[PDB]
Amino acid sequence: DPFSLVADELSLLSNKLREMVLAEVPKLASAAEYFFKRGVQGKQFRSTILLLMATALDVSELRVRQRGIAEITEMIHVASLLHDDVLDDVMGNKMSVLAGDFLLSRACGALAALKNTEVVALLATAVEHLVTGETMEITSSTAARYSMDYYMQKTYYKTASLISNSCKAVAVLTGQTAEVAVLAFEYGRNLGLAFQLIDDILDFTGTSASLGKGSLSDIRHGVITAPILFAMEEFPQLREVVDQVAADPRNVDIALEYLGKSKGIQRARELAMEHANLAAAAIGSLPETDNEDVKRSRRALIDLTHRVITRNK
Amino acid sequence: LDPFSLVADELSLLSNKLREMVLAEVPKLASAAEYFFKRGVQGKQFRSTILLLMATALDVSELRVRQRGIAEITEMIHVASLLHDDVLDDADTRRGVGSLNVVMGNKMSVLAGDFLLSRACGALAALKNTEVVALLATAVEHLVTGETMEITSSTAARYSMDYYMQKTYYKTASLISNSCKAVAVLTGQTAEVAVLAFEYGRNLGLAFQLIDDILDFTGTSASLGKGSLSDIRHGVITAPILFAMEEFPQLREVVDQVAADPRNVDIALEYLGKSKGIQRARELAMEHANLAAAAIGSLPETDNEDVKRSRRALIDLTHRVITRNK
Ligand SMILES: CC(C)=CCC/C(C)=C/CC/C(C)=C/COP(=O)(O)OP(=O)(O)O
Ligand SMILES: CC(C)=CCC/C(C)=C/CC/C(C)=C/COP(=O)(O)OP(=O)(O)O
Numbered sequence: 001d002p003f004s005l006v007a008d009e010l011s012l013l014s015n016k017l018r019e020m021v022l023a024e025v026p027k028l029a030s031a032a033e034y035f036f037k038r039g040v041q042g043k044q045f046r047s048t049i050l051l052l053m054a055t056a057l058d059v060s061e062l063r064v065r066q067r068g069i070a071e072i073t074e075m076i077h078v079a080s081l082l083h084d085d086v087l088d089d090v091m092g093n094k095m096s097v098l099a100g101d102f103l104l105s106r107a108c109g110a111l112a113a114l115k116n117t118e119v120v121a122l123l124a125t126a127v128e129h130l131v132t133g134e135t136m137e138i139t140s141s142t143a144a145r146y147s148m149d150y151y152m153q154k155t156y157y158k159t160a161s162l163i164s165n166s167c168k169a170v171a172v173l174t175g176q177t178a179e180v181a182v183l184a185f186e187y188g189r190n191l192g193l194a195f196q197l198i199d200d201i202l203d204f205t206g207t208s209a210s211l212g213k214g215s216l217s218d219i220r221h222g223v224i225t226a227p228i229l230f231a232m233e234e235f236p237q238l239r240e241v242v243d244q245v246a247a248d249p250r251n252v253d254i255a256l257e258y259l260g261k262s263k264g265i266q267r268a269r270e271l272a273m274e275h276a277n278l279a280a281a282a283i284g285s286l287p288e289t290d291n292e293d294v295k296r297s298r299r300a301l302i303d304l305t306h307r308v309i310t311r312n313k
Numbered sequence: 314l315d316p317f318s319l320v321a322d323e324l325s326l327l328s329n330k331l332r333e334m335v336l337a338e339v340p341k342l343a344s345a346a347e348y349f350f351k352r353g354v355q356g357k358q359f360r361s362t363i364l365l366l367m368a369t370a371l372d373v374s375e376l377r378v379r380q381r382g383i384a385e386i387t388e389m390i391h392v393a394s395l396l397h398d399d400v401l402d403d404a405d406t407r408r409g410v411g412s413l414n415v416v417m418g419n420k421m422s423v424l425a426g427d428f429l430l431s432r433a434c435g436a437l438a439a440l441k442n443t444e445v446v447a448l449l450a451t452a453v454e455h456l457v458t459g460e461t462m463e464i465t466s467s468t469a470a471r472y473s474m475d476y477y478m479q480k481t482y483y484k485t486a487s488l489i490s491n492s493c494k495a496v497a498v499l500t501g502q503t504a505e506v507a508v509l510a511f512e513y514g515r516n517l518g519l520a521f522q523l524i525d526d527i528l529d530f531t532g533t534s535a536s537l538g539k540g541s542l543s544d545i546r547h548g549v550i551t552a553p554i555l556f557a558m559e560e561f562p563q564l565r566e567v568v569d570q571v572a573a574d575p576r577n578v579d580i581a582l583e584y585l586g587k588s589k590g591i592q593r594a595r596e597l598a599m600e601h602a603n604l605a606a607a608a609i610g611s612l613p614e615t616d617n618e619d620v621k622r623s624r625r626a627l628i629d630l631t632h633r634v635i636t637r638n639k
């Protein structure tokens with residue numbers, strides 16, 4: 001019973017080798033050092049929109065609660081990021097689960113503190129859609145992965161639902177009408193779709209900080225985005241190239257050549273502009289005001305619908 | 314008039330209600346979310362049982378549907394924990410069946426849980442009562458605080474009855490107390506009556522856990538060693554052991570070194586044996602069980618026979634929670 005024969009010494013060792021616990025329990029301090037350092041924390045794009053929207057609607061404790069929704073939204077965003085990191089593929093995805101749950105529980109806590117069940121419903125739906133989108137991203141009929149309509153549903157759940165429902169939440173907290181609320185929702189929904197679509201293009205285009213030659217992150221990892229989906233309508237031969245990207249990694253470069261002879265990038269950007277225009281229409285349709293701060297915010301919101309398209313970063 | 318049988322059919326109604334409530338396309342998300350809600354794999358539905366009985370106990374089917382909601386939300390919250398719990402605590406078994414983290418993977422388990430939480434908030438919103446939203450949000454915060462304590466605390470912290478008492482409340486009794494309070498609040502009972510419903514849930518929950526911790530050691534039969542000892546094998550340190558450490562300090566290094574040397578399981582049982590640990594744990598549980606019964610006793614007098622029958626069964630659980638042979 002070999003293990004039984006040397007238990008004495010095993011425990012001396014097992015004990016000693018708890019030098020990694022104890023000593024080195026701090027020097028989590030790396031964790032704190034790493035968090036500050038990151039490359040962000042965030043650009044605060046969702047927060048910017050939400051604070052602007054709060055101002056952009058005619059109506060302190062209210063401004064405190066409105067910011068409450070920007071706070072909740074960030075909490076919900078990071079929790080979804082973390083849970084999406086939970087790997088099936090040492091594994092660190094116990095950290096992601098615990099941290100995600102702390103943020104979600106804090107979100108619930110803060111939703112409860114708003115004392116508005118209608119906004120609770122909106123962020124509840126937001127959470128459900130994020131979860132739905134991620135399931136869609138992971139599981140999928142091979143056929144499904146190649147449908148532009150499916151991609152756009154998935155894109156809506158993953159990227160636009162959180163922001164649309166938050167924009168609507170800000171409307172509802174501010175006591176706006178059902179018809180104004182549906183405007184703020186539509187601003188977020190449409191701006192969000194545009195933002196993601198521009199993100200998809202930037203992966204292939206690159207950036208000024210980029211080489212400047214796209215990182216190609218999506219296509220390396222078999223994530224199929226709008227430009228490539230559009231390019232497959234033109235070149236059916238491309239379906240085969242994209243499939244064989246893992247098997248043979250030079251199929252990335254070949255995919256790139258197809259895209260460059262196609263209207264894929266153009267068609268994704270034209271779709272983004274269509275969405276961004278619709279967002280600016282939503283602000284345009286907002287009830288007339290005389291307030292200068294309010295009108296300044298609405299101009300900003302509309303400005304954001306232009307800057308989202310022309311992003312080089 | 315038996316409390317489980319007295320509520321059994323509404324539990325099946327709730328059971329089926331949960332199934333549509335948890336339904337979702339995408340289908341893969343549906344498989345995951347529904348997994349612990351089908352006939353046979355719902356668990357013993359003790360939280361629901363207490364809630365339906367409590368619902369009747371407080372009284373005067375327009376409002377009952379709302380009260381049922383609380384049991385459904387509570388069950389959804391509950392199952393959400395388990396799913397997340399199984400990814401942590403790295404299980405392969407739950408409810409006599411493959412756990413979701415083995416069957417469907419870690420990712421689906423965690424998404425299913427988030428899904429169930431959001432449906433729970435959804436249903437909480439639909440009830441349009443802000444105090445009820447806050448009561449169940451507290452419960453969710455408490456679950457996370459409690460799960461975190463069971464993991465995170467340093468060694469010196471974990472080995473006191475104070476710590477155990479807090480962790481148990483957050484991890485186990487908070488869901489029962491707050492949902493008990495919510496049921497009461499939904500009926501627009503005075504603030505004081507809501508507290509009575511809260512003290513009941515709180516004390517019954519704490520008493521249930523104490524007895525469960527003892528049964529790990531004793532088992533079906535009364536004496537020591539018949540039980541599975543699953544907690545102490547894995548290095549979970551429940552009340553019997555903690556009380557024993559009050560008598561025998563040297564037991565701390567023994568229990569702390571259990572994982573490394575599984576022969577330290579036997580040494581700990583010898584220490585438990587000489588101690589009054591099992592006994593004091595029981596004595597604590599009997600004290601909680603008392604306060605629970607006492608709370609129901611302070612409820613306002615009623616004429617209704619169906620109410621009395623239901624009040625008597627909540628008390629019956631007060632005795633049964635101590636008595637449970639298993
Ligand atoms: C729903 C959602 C996620 C919406 C996005 C919100 C939004 C439009 C954020 C701002 C984007 C922006 C101004 C980028 C600047 O890049 P740049 O290269 O244009 O820098 P520059 O404008 O200073 O030249
Ligand atoms: C709302 C949500 C998703 C919260 C996450 C926090 C979390 C994982 C809580 C777990 C609470 C719980 C029921 C523990 C019991 O499991 P046990 O291991 O003590 O005993 P058991 O596995 O046999 O139930």
Ligand SMILES: C=C(C)CCSP(=O)(O)OP(=O)(O)O
Nearest residue numbers: 355356357359360485518521
């Ligand atoms: C505090 C309680 C009454 C707990 C019992 S819940 P428990 O996890 O034991 O039971 P299930 O739902 O069957 O898994």
Ligand SMILES: [Mg+2]
Nearest residue numbers: 398399402404
């Ligand atoms: Mg477990």
Ligand SMILES: [Mg+2]
Nearest residue numbers: 398402460463
């Ligand atoms: Mg646990």
